[PDB]
C-alpha cells in the first residue's frame, strides 16, 4: 500500500503558475482520500479540473472544490452529495495541511482548503486528509491574490489535475 499522490496545475487568469502535489493519507482516512483522488482524476465523470479557488484569506487558507456552483454553495462527493466525517485523528498542525470544508457535522462534499498556517480551532470539526508534498511555494504565491474577506483579485483555477502515484 502506498498513499496516493495527486497534483494540481494552478493558473492565474489563464496564465500557468505551477504544480502543487499532495500526499493523501489513505491509510488513516481511506474514504475521504478516495473521494479527493477520484475527483482529481475526473474518473466518475466530474471533478476539480477547470474549477476555481473561490476564497483565499492570506495567513489562513485557500478554499476550492466547488465545481458545480463555483462559489462555496456546491460540489458533491463521489458517494452522493455529502458523506460523513470519517474520523478526526489528524490535526491542523501547520502550513500545507489538506482538510475538508463543510457546513456542519457529516456534510462533506468536494470543497477542501489548504492551510497556510496552523489552525488548531478547526481540529475535531474538519477532517484532515492530506498534505502538500511539493509546490508549497505555488500555494504561497496563490495567497497573494486573496484578501481579508476571501475574494481573490485574479481568477485562480485548477487548469489540470491528476494522480501521480
Amino acid at each position: 500500500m502506498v498513499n496516493p499522490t495527486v497534483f494540481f496545475d494552478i493558473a492565474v487568469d489563464g496564465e500557468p503558475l505551477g504544480r502543487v502535489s499532495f500526499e493523501l493519507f489513505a491509510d488513516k482516512v481511506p474514504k475521504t482520500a478516495e473521494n479527493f483522488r477520484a475527483l482529481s482524476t475526473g474518473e466518475k465523470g466530474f471533478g476539480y479540473k477547470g474549477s476555481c479557488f473561490h476564497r483565499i484569506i492570506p495567513g489562513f487558507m485557500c478554499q476550492g472544490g466547488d465545481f458545480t456552483r463555483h462559489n462555496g454553495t456546491g460540489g458533491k462527493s463521489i458517494y452522493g452529495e455529502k458523506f460523513e466525517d470519517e474520523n478526526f485523528i489528524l490535526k491542523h498542525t501547520g502550513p500545507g495541511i489538506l482538510s475538508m470544508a463543510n457546513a456542519g457535522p457529516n456534510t462533506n462534499g468536494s470543497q477542501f482548503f489548504i492551510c497556510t498556517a496552523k489552525t488548531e480551532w478547526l481540529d475535531g470539526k474538519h477532517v484532515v486528509f492530506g498534505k502538500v508534498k511539493e509546490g508549497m511555494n505555488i500555494v504561497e504565491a496563490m495567497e497573494r491574490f486573496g484578501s481579508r474577506n476571501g475574494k481573490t483579485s485574479k481568477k485562480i483555477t485548477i487548469a489540470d489535475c491528476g494522480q501521480l502515484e
Binding site: 484569506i57 460540489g75 456534510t107 489552525t119 480551532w121 478547526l122 474538519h126
Partner: peptide, 11 residues
Amino acid sequence: XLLVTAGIVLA
C-alpha cells in the same frame, strides 16, 4: 472569524 464553511460563511 476564521471558518471554512460551504454556504453560510460566518465571521
